[PDB]
Design a protein around this ligand. Structure first.
Ligand SMILES: [Mg+2]
Ligand SMILES: [Mg+2]
Ligand SMILES: [Mg+2]
Ligand SMILES: [Mg+2]
Ligand SMILES: [Mg+2]
Ligand SMILES: [Mg+2]
Ligand SMILES: [Mg+2]
Ligand SMILES: [Mg+2]
Ligand SMILES: [Mg+2]
Ligand SMILES: [Mg+2]
Ligand SMILES: [Mg+2]
Ligand SMILES: [Mg+2]
Ligand SMILES: [Mg+2]
Ligand SMILES: [Mg+2]
Ligand SMILES: [Mg+2]
Ligand SMILES: [Mg+2]
Ligand SMILES: [Mg+2]
Ligand SMILES: [Mg+2]
Lengths: 251, 251, 251, 251
């Protein structure tokens, strides 16, 4: 298929669930991939499960670690050549209302979900601009970038922030002829091993008052829209939100 | 690539510009295609330019013609088997403010841009539901479904209508387990022979205060997002808006 | 408090429910009001219930009646002097999915909810512009202009149309220095005698999965935002959507 | 006209510009007001300029100061009785693209524009809920919470965050019957002494390609929508965005 011929992608939080599915489809479409995660044990296994080191490698990194971003770009370029594609996918959740959010929980979530995406987007523009790469930055949001959830206060703040920051970056890149696109992807509920580990979670998410399709998605649902956005097929798409949510936000 | 293996698509206004590009990429991805247009001379030439009759045929139809919709579905099924995919792409423009719109202009534009999309969406749900086809209805909007243009009053009304009607149809199909998805596609400015025929049009559309990328798109920009939405790759996307606009709506 | 000192307002469907509450608060704030409605028994009683003929009168009109719009503006100007304020409030509903909508039902709903708002907006701009009136056109959309409802297909189309058409009109009026603002108001569910006539309707609308406040609104909820938008307090608001919905669209 | 009879309001950054106009109209409508600001010379003068200490007082506070928020609520309750109304208005700007944003600039802007609004919203819910006050939290976003600006990266992030976090808070308050509403106000460009201090700023903002009305707003434009949202007139409005922008976001 070779829809990502010659592309070199960094995928943060690429060792599990949505990130791992994006990495898998990226390799299948001819991209070279560097996945990140916090745990070397999980990360090296994940890279090997997808392909050989000529196709995909692992780099241990917390996306909240500003200095580590420089080392991640350097390692990816050393392995595969200049980075063309960044998927800011690393994220954490706090299951608290705004009212019940402790300040430490607030700061920890924003460090990964907002500062991390800022650090990646900023360095991505700096390193990928003006190189004829057809560069693409895909900032992972969720439906929680569009609608509130009473028990995801900090999460909602982080997703709203990434949603509009990404538009700012898309515009600056476009106006400066940088050859860098910036778009957001907004998954609804997605079935992962982590969802499977919480009894009744998928059933609650599958109720029609949540997901009109009456079931939740799979990681490949998000992988396929990321292939489109990483590919030159989407060369006129910038500053846009792409929602894949089983109808969640349509009602 | 075969991303539309076994799909049978109707594309209204499929003889020119965006519609013809959608038809071309659909055939390339393994879909059987029936294109419509008002002029048999243009339509038969267009079908032949894309492929052989085993791949693509033409059906003369005004999308405002309610009775003709039944005949179009019948002709497509006779040629290719049950229809899986409908692209409601036929549309016209009136270059008038709301203030300066004559009632006849208002009714003529709504007949094609709103009634036509209603007729196609309604019949599409009726004929494609409950057949395991992975059915997909793609309602063509534009940026004028999101933002006003002071000199496109009727056009804006039609695009806002299709945008939210499509969400209603997506939800009903999802809740009733119909196996029909409904999504909207929102092109920004797209270079076509019709744009080329108006001196200075592309230059005005390419100003940064209109399109931040400083150029307009090409028909294939819309073809590629339509391949995604017609394909089973987008099986969790329903009731969603997909914008491909060079940053127009991001500012 | 005289917040509409000197204003002259037409309110379509002003004899019942939301329209009647807008008329009531408009008179209380010093506006002269012409209310319209289909039935003279109801209309004359409604006008007399709010105030004396020097304050408020009734004009029998169906908002789908284009010719009647000219007679309505002429009658209002004869009674009260030049019209400054138009509330396009008249609307009807069809309780059908897009799939199950008959063409006659489609056409009848669009004649009131879309053509009627177009006729009023177009004539309002022509008659109210360039007169130093601080003119304001308030187009009644709905939460159904933002999100789909599987059983309100034609209604969704009409409300999406009014939402975006109003932006077109707002921009043209602003760019041409017409001294006419155009904004949309988007009620959630509002208790009226008509809702009271539908057994279980208020209860369904009050479910937390629909209205997070766990109850529906009252006509004065919409009257108060209309006073703001008709008043010179909102002289910098144009092309905007004002949602009063108990949280319906926030989730 | 006493539209805020009995209300007790905290307005952050209430000593200048928009915040000062909100404080002025709040006192005129019968609210008791505590304004905050960083500087005592400016703050005490601002309070005295609006009214007597029985009507309005000053409290020195940086909205990024978490501990100060407790002292601010305690001081306001000591002066005026229980707080009913919070306007999170304090904000700062960084004139940088995402690419050119230094990490220190990023952190300083988020401390005021995001952490400060979080601290105020969280404490406001805890202190104002379940007291029959008709409590209202008004979070000052911006047009920059809807659309990107290529040279306001960190600002865009902060305003997108406040936009969606406010929906989370609105839903939790509504679902738990807290008698607290949370809404966002989104000013376009507003003339203040600070804008006056930036040569050519108002002129750039007044270009029709930015503000279709061809001029910018004034602080009272934002004061009037805040009176509506603080008042019991808006008792059915929660989780909503209120835009007053001269048409900026309509195109
Ligand atoms: Mg997992
Ligand atoms: Mg790991
Ligand atoms: Mg760096
Ligand atoms: Mg580019
Ligand atoms: Mg053409
Ligand atoms: Mg033709
Ligand atoms: Mg039929
Ligand atoms: Mg389906
Ligand atoms: Mg009547
Ligand atoms: Mg039928
Ligand atoms: Mg005006
Ligand atoms: Mg409640
Ligand atoms: Mg919703
Ligand atoms: Mg101060
Ligand atoms: Mg730097
Ligand atoms: Mg309240
Ligand atoms: Mg103007
Ligand atoms: Mg815009």
């Amino acid at each position: 298929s070779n829809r990502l011929d010659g592309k070199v992608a960094i995928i943060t939080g690429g060792t599990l669930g949505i990130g791992l599915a994006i990495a898998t489809k990226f390799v299948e479409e001819g991209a070279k991939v560097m996945i990140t995660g916090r745990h070397s044990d999980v990360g090296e296994k994940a890279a090997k499960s997808v392909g050989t080191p000529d196709q995909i490698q692992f780099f241990q990194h917390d996306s909240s670690d500003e200095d580590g971003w420089t080392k991640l770009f350097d390692a990816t370029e050393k392995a595969f050549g200049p980075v063309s594609t960044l998927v800011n996918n690393a994220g954490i959740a706090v299951n608290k209302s705004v009212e019940e959010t402790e300040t430490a929980e607030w700061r920890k979530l924003l460090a990964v979900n907002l500062d991390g995406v800022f650090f990646g987007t900023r360095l991505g523009i700096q390193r990928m601009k003006n190189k004829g790469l057809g560069a693409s930055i895909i900032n992972m949001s969720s439906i929680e970038g569009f609608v509130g959830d009473p028990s995801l206060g900090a999460y909602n703040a982080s997703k709203g922030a990434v949603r509009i920051m990404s538009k700012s970056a898309a515009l600056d890149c476009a106006l400066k002829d940088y050859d860098v696109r910036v778009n957001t992807v907004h998954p609804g509920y997605i079935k992962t091993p982590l969802v499977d580990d919480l009894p009744g979670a998928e059933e609650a998410m599958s109720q029609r008052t949540k997901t009109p399709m009456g079931h939740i998605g799979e990681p490949n649902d998000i992988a396929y829209i990321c292939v489109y956005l990483a590919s030159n097929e989407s060369k006129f798409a910038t500053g846009s939100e792409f929602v894949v949510d089983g109808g969640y936000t349509a009602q």
